[PDB]
Amino acid sequence: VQLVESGGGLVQPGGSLRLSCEASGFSFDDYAIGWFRQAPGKEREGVSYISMSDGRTYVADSVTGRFTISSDNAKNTVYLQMNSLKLEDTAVYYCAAGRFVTFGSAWSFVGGGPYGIDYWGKGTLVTVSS
Amino acid sequence: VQLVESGGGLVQPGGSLRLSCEASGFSFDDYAIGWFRQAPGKEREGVSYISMSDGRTYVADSVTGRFTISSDNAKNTVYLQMNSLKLEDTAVYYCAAGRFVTFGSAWSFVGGGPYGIDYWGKGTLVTVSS
Amino acid sequence: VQLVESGGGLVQPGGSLRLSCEASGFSFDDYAIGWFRQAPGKEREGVSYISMSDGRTYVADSVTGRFTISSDNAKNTVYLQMNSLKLEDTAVYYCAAGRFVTFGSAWSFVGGGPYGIDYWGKGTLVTVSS
Amino acid sequence: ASIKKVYRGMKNGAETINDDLEAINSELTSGGNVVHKTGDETIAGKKTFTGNVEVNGSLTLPTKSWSGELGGGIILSLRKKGTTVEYSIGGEISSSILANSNLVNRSVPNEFCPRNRCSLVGHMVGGWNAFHIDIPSSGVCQWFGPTASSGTPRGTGTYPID
Amino acid sequence: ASIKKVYRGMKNGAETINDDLEAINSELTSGGNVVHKTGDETIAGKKTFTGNVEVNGSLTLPTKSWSGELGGGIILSLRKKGTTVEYSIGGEISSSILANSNLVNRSVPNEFCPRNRCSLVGHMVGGWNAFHIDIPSSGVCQWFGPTASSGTPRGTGTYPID
Amino acid sequence: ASIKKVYRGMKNGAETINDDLEAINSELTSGGNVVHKTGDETIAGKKTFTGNVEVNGSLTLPTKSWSGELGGGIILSLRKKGTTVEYSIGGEISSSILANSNLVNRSVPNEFCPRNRCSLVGHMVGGWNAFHIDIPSSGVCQWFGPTASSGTPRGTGTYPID
């Protein structure tokens, strides 16, 4: 039962970065794996998630056209390709696994815990600065 | 102060059923009486309710065109006519009485307790199977 | 750290009233100051607020075209001009100061306390009767 | 909230969208199935607070009382509040209670019985004498003073329960 | 949230609908009048939990302390935490305290007074002697040891309050 | 909820608005970051209740136990529940314990140590004898009975901790 992140770092605006999350120790049939982010100066916000069964995805409005999510169930790993990075994308990015429901293109995490998420990674820092 | 249900049973898809709720022991001036339903595998969802004063109604999207609510204040009884029954209508159906507010065709139950409802019936099982 | 109201009173429908709130003891850079109202027979509802920095405003639908908010940072005072008063405007009006976020014309107060508000005034009674 | 479907080709679309937004928004202030920062509310389900909790008002837990003469005139008055039992020793020794003897007039009811033997220390009015009464898991209390045939036993305290 | 009306014939309709959805959605994460699964929040109103509650951090209830010399050199130190009073007997007997006498230097303040007489058992340093001090609803404490003119009284425990 | 932007010139506008309304509305019943009136939920952050709180089920606080022979055969069994320590005196005096002596076989661990000296009153089986054991902030317990070389010490109660 672990979610291990990597790929975070310092980049200039317009830069690119690729995050990875190694998910092991649980079913997948009922889960979506994805990413949030958080300032030290904020609550969490959802970024992008992928259904581990059918591959349906969610991508937040603040990042549409710039960030794309990928998976590979074998390596137990999910990817976030972050392009055209902006100063406001600076945050710590957490890998997350949660049970969910969809209403077309809109999603909701159904867990009893914070943000409706069952498991969290330790987080990977993404810094975008001039 | 009682809400007594009846009419639940086993039916095949395309089948029909009629639920009844005998409501006694409270005013009515401020109440709507109606139905929810719940899997053992779910939270409650609202199905259909009727204002006990003016008779305005609510019918959930999942059941529009198939389920219709009726009342008769004298027998202290509300009815749910369930037509064109589907496998996904299988649940235990609870009669409920609650104080409410409306915003045109949209409703909200205002009670301090679960689902904003004041009183609940014991529930009637509706089973739809091949 | 005080919010002092004045201007409430009894008026006939179609009447006018002007509320004032003397806000002192805090920054302003991060605050919006405004008004709620509440029946003894209700929860609070937001009426109108003004950003203490950029002056952007919010005016509730129930009062649009009738109530207008003003400020003057020096006297540490915010104003609510209430015109074409209706019976349903009867309530106690509370001055409030809160940290907030906007989504175009829509607002949300972000505080950890009730209604997302940090500080409240004592309230001023507005009575509209024939 | 109980909302209406917004769909391709519906009549009164703007009105329906507005109605739905208003009903949903109403539940961010009060009612429905959400817990709010105001209002008297009843909350079902197991709630686990991982952080610190402060209660400025009263904190009321389930309560039940029982009182009875254990034996030899000794009265034990109990009040269970959560997992704690508040006790008060009373009465007056009315017959000889042998050293180490079981008190057989009344047993403490099962719901007030501890997991392990609890020793309730008491004192006799008018002198320097102390005793203790054990409450075992069986509720068959035992006197651990010496043989005694008179006196006024007292003592207030608590013991734990599961 | 504070939303804008969506109406028949408005300009910037899509923008208004989106703004309203975003403001409402923001309150499902934090702020407004809703209690969230994260964040430091202040919650008004009577809250009744019908199920089981777990607190992993600290649970802080209202607290107040009082200490005073009841009489004859006996000191009683109290701390009220919810409906329980934590007590500690201290001091040193400085004058003769008669058997069954009221302690009249200080009464326990009304807010620390129990519903019914509570018997606080204590012990005297250096020997086998026990006593008890009663705290009645009046707060006029009573010594239930024998007549005593010296010694060091001690004892820590609790008694209930309303 | 995780919603889609409603914007000027989008395709499937009604469908997107409906999807967003449904996802938001779902969180007024369960899930997301909101606390509900039903369901088993885990809640982070400092929560301050300004009003009255009632718990109808159990209220579980952090718990830890410790037991050890303080010295001279005297056993002290402890259980910390929030800011209260439940104690039970046990064992049997197996060597001479001098009047006013420190018990040096085991100290009470720091996490069970009170802010100020707590005097735990106990009683010796089979007679009228009482004693007390002090637990200071250091956890180096002290015997306040007279010099004693035998007997069965008992006593159940509580003392406070920070």
From TrEMBL, chains D, E, F:
<dbReference type="GO" id="GO:0046718">
    <property type="term" value="P:symbiont entry into host cell"/>
</dbReference>
<keyword id="KW-1160">Virus entry into host cell</keyword>
<protein>
    <submittedName>
        <fullName>BPP</fullName>
    </submittedName>
</protein>
<dbReference type="InterPro" id="IPR015027">
    <property type="entry name" value="Caudo_bapla_RBP"/>
</dbReference>
<dbReference type="GO" id="GO:0019062">
    <property type="term" value="P:virion attachment to host cell"/>
</dbReference>
<keyword id="KW-1161">Viral attachment to host cell</keyword>
<dbReference type="Pfam" id="PF18338">
    <property type="entry name" value="BppL_N"/>
</dbReference>
<dbReference type="InterPro" id="IPR008982">
    <property type="entry name" value="Adenovirus_pIV-like_att"/>
</dbReference>
<dbReference type="InterPro" id="IPR040956">
    <property type="entry name" value="BppL_N"/>
</dbReference>
<feature type="domain" description="Lower baseplate protein N-terminal">
    <location>
        <begin position="34"/>
        <end position="52"/>
    </location>
</feature>
<dbReference type="GO" id="GO:0098025">
    <property type="term" value="C:virus tail, baseplate"/>
</dbReference>
<dbReference type="Pfam" id="PF08931">
    <property type="entry name" value="Caudo_bapla_RBP"/>
</dbReference>
<keyword id="KW-0946">Virion</keyword>
<feature type="domain" description="Receptor-binding protein of phage tail base-plate Siphoviridae head">
    <location>
        <begin position="65"/>
        <end position="160"/>
    </location>
</feature>
<dbReference type="GO" id="GO:0007155">
    <property type="term" value="P:cell adhesion"/>
</dbReference>
<keyword id="KW-0945">Host-virus interaction</keyword>
